[PDB]
């Protein structure tokens, strides 16, 4: 069987979520359902940006970081995959996975998904970066009711999970330690908490997993078949040997039509066989301008939807004139945030002093957006990895750095304006009273960030 078509790598890059998706044209789109999440995260990793953007790494630092990356990641994708699990997004060290479920079957479907998570802490015991550093994960798990919000325009399209659920996944997530898997208190109060020895987190509904102790006839593969009964497209049959039933896709002209737009151009054009394979993995200098939105209420898509919508409309415009792009749109604990990125699009003279005002067009317009509570913006400049990241079977491009981070979090630390940091301070070509020096604050993940600045604009106001 031929499996390489166009639209077979396509799908590589998107979830069953939305290969096997049938969405109105209607923007917003929303859609209902439940099941169970799989927040997962490799440490030790911050370590290693550092340890390949030295000399040592004789200018192919961003090739050996995709490789020792992936090769890790891609065990923790196979997994995951043969366990039944759809992988929704990466982004780094950390991957995002649903087990969508009827109802009913939540309480055998946390027990696999638990299952899956001690086989991923299993994967690194006895397991390390280099000599002396290790490598572990934290997961977090979560079930519940999920909403799909898809958003987009003519030819772009995005999507992200919301509700409670993908709150306290994120949440299971930030108290795991490394080793741990974390349950929600909806987990715990929805799981067979006969099979499940946990124990309390201090100062914490959420629970920490130490066994799982099933009864004396309990066969877990007969287990795992029964429930693969309930899932729409485990692979079977004649396909049983196969990761992803998407592997499967023909060309259907529609079909790739409607996928195409989840994937940026320059993916598509390594797809179609007319750039080098290895294009994208680079150490680039780049800007990065994070754009997070608050509403009063992130659980409730049938508020945040439209407002997502009108906001993307905006900054899709903004950027194409000022020649950047929307590289991925997140949902953190607080707000949507979209990541978007000047320089690798064409690497442009007045790269910075552009970031910076599609920043402000942004900021303005979308601080006027009905349920828009506040916006903030981070704005920072440097050397970053890109490539794509993940399985043959399932990946996707992702960028990673200090610089990502660092505009991450002045637009969590500093709500409510515009922030830049010095590189982009320093080379914007813009006069010092466009800005304001701001009181340096201690930030999570961030060492010695740098002096900060807010992009005050051009006039007193
Ligand atoms: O901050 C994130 C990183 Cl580093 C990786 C991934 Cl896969 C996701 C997030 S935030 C986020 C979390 C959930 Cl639970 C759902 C969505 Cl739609 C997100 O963007």
């Not at 079930?143 to 987009?152: D, K, N, P, R």
């Not at 301008?289 to 209420?297: A, I, K, P, T």
């Amino acid at each position: 069987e031929f499996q390489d078509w166009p639209i077979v790598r396509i799908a590589a890059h998107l979830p069953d979520l939305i290969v096997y998706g049938h969405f109105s044209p209607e923007r917003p789109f929303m859609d209902y359902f439940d099941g169970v999440l799989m927040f997962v995260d490799i440490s030790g990793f911050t370590a290693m940006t550092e340890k390949f953007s030295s000399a040592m790494y004789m200018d192919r630092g961003a090739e050996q970081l995709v490789e020792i990356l992936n090769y890790h990641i891609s065990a923790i994708v196979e997994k995951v995959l043969i366990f039944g699990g759809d992988i929704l997004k990466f982004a780094g060290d950390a991957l995002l996975a649903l087990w969508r479920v009827e109802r009913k079957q939540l309480k055998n479907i946390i027990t696999v998904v638990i299952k899956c998570s001690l086989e991923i802490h299993g994967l690194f015991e006895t397991q390390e970066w280099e000599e002396g550093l290790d490598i572990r994960v934290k997961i977090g798990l979560a079930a519940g009711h999920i909403s799909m919000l898809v958003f987009g325009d003519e030819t772009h399209s995005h999507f992200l999970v919301i509700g409670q659920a993908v709150d306290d996944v994120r949440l299971a997530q930030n108290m795991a330690q490394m080793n741990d898997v974390i349950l929600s208190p909806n987990c715990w109060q929805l799981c067979d908490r006969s099979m499940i020895e946990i124990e309390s987190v201090p100062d914490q509904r959420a629970v920490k997993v130490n066994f799982l102790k099933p009864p004396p006839n309990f066969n877990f593969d007969e287990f795992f078949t029964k429930c693969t009964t309930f899932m729409h497209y485990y692979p079977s049959g004649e396909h049983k040997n196969l990761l992803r039933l998407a592997c499967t896709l023909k060309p259907d002209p529609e079909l790739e039509m409607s996928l195409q737009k989840y994937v940026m151009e320059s993916i598509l054009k390594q797809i179609d066989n007319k750039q080098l394979q290895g294009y994208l993995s680079e150490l680039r200098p780049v800007t990065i301008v994070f754009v997070n939105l608050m509403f009063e209420d992130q659980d409730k898509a049938e508020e945040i939807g439209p407002a997502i919508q009108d906001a993307y409309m905006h900054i899709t415009s903004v950027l194409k004139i000022f020649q950047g792009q929307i590289n991925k749109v997140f949902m953190f604990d607080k707000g949507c945030s979209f990541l978007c990125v000047f320089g690798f699009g064409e690497k442009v003279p007045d790269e910075l002093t552009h970031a910076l005002e599609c920043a402000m067009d942004i900021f303005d317009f979308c601080s006027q957006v009905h349920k828009i509570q506040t916006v903030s913006i981070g704005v920072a400049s440097g050397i970053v990895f890109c490539g794509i990241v993940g399985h043959t079977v399932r990946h996707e491009y992702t960028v990673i750095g200090q610089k990502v981070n660092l505009a991450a979090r002045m637009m969590m630390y500093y709500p409510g304006i515009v922030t830049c940091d010095s590189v982009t301070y320093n080379g914007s070509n813009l006069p010092a009273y466009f800005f304001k020096e701001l009181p340096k604050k201690v930030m999570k993940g961030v060492a010695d960030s740098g002096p900060l600045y807010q992009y005050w604009g051009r006039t007193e106001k």
